[PDB]
Amino acid sequence: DQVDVKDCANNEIKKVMVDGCHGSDPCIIHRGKPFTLEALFDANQNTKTAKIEIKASLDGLEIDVPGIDTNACHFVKCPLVKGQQYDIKYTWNVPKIAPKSENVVVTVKLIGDNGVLACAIATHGKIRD
């Protein structure tokens, strides 16, 4: 279930899995269909708030989905304890209007009171029906 990702913070992300995806094989995102991704990370700070932002980049265009709950504290027990490990299961869903692509990079970022909590990049994404 684990998928290959590139860290873009300081390695607090230990592993990330996304429904129906494996290693470095194409990870298909179906438009309008709920995409569920799970990330296991180590809190690099003590913080009472946590925000999670997911963005997709494709052929010179970057997209995000408005109208989704970005308060990570609705998915894990906050405040977060530095050094302690957390497992967040977040459901994302790209609208049908999103253009299709065979080259999409997905970045998952968590932000805390004192800055970036975690950052990971999945480079084998594909948006299709």
Curated annotation (Swiss-Prot):
Locations listed in the record: Secreted
A Pfam family hit: E1_DerP2_DerF2
Any one biological process term the GO annotation gives: sterol transport
Recorded GO CC terms: extracellular region
Alphabetical keyword list: Allergen, Disulfide bond, Secreted, Signal
Keyword Secreted: yes
Disulfide cross-links: 8-119, 21-27, 73-78
MF term (GO), any: sterol binding
Superkingdom per UniProt: Eukaryota
Keyword Calcium applies: no
PANTHER family the UniProt entry points to: NIEMANN PICK TYPE C2 PROTEIN NPC2-RELATED, NPC INTRACELLULAR CHOLESTEROL TRANSPORTER 2
Extra remark: The sequence shown here is from clone 2. The N-terminal sequence (AA 1-8) from clone 1 and 11 are not yet known.
Family of the protein in this entry: Belongs to the NPC2 family.
Protein name: Mite group 2 allergen Der f 2
Origin species: Dermatophagoides farinae
Phylogenetic placement of the source organism: Eukaryota, Metazoa, Ecdysozoa, Arthropoda, Chelicerata
Protein encoded by which gene: DERF2
